[PDB]
């Protein structure tokens with residue numbers, strides 16, 4: 001019949017239900033291939049994950065799965081199936097299945113022209129999904145053009161929740177430059193300064209970034225990371241006002257910004273010659289330095305720019321929000337595995 005298949009060395013045993021495998025991405029430990037579902041008449045994407053030997057990897061997996069199974073929304077990727085061993089000791093890896101989409105927003109920015117109507121569509125769908133995730137008291141914490149999948153009819157869907165978690169604004173403060181492995185440039189400025197990214201505002205900043213990249217049809221954040229990057233952002237938005245400085249109740253982060261030379265604000269309209277003014281309005285409000293002054297999803301959705309798509313009654317919220325204690329490691333790899341096992345129980349016959 002079938003049996004453990006091969007790609008580029010690793011074992012991708014997912015048939016007979018899924019066949020005709022095609023490698024898609026490295027992913028370090030996690031390997032994604034495309035396949036074909038034989039039971040249903042559809043094409044699919046499937047990721048083989050093999051954590052269990054590292055508590056940090058188990059963190060990611062449990063988050064992606066748990067959250068994604070709990071969620072049910074058109075603009076959020078849905079898990080079709082999960083292949084894994086019937087018992088715990090036999091379980092060494094997890095194969096997650098999803099609808100094969102087509103491409104991601106990062107590739108579109110780098111190879112296609114994004115017109116006004118398209119940018120408006122994508123932005124709306126991104127916010128609609130984000131509205132639901134925030135209503136569930138969840139923060140994505142890693143939004144980027146690569147985490148936004150699209151099909152051939154332009155329907156967009158958010159996907160990677162490996163870094164997502166329950167908001168928690170009361171513990172958002174962390175102290176100047178303490179690092180946090182992520183690898184990107186779409187993360188909010190305050191995270192580098194005095195925050196650990198525990199509030200909704202972090203996702204909004206991200207969305208704002210992808211809106212700007214969509215507007216210039218290229219990645220605005222290419223090279224130069226951490227501080228260098230922050231200085232460039234300030235060179236665009238303008239130096240933080242004293243008002244803004246009150247928010248920062250920490251001498252180290254506060255003083256560092258005082259260290260920087262005066263930067264004049266560079267209006268977006270002078271950067272994007274032919275660009276809808278309403279779009280620039282939304283941009284400016286989404287990309288503000290002070291997270292507190294930053295616009296919320298509700299506001300964004302109702303902004304004039306999205307006027308042709310806006311419809312509250314067709315923009316559902318969670319249904320089952322939460323607020324668990326697992327947060328921030330503090331949990332043996334073994335227990336995580338147990339939890340992961342239970343979490344995937346629903347896909348095994350019974």
Ligand SMILES: C=CCn1nc(N)c2cc(-c3c(-c4ccccc4)nn4ccccc34)nnc21
Pocket residue numbers: 024032045046047096097098099100101102103104146147149150159160
């Ligand atoms: C978008 C073009 C093709 N394609 N279609 C998908 N749904 C798809 C998804 C992904 C994908 C998956 C993933 C794949 C299978 C099961 C669980 C998670 N995780 N993931 C994490 C970061 C960025 C992309 C991505 N990478 N390529 C894909």
